[PDB]
Structure formats: structure tokens, C-alpha cells
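Q: Please design a sequence for this.
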């Protein structure tokens, strides 16, 4: 999977 805008959610918490 490539989390393009989804990385922001699963990066800080």
C-alpha cells in the first residue's frame, strides 16, 4: 500500500 494523504493520520498517532 502507498499512504499518500493517509500517512498524516498514521504518523503523529
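A: Design:
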Amino acid at each position: 500500500f502507498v499512504p499518500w494523504f493517509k500517512k498524516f493520520x498514521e504518523r503523529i498517532l
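Q: Thanks. Anything notable?
A: The helical segments are 9-12. The first helix runs from residue 9 to 12.
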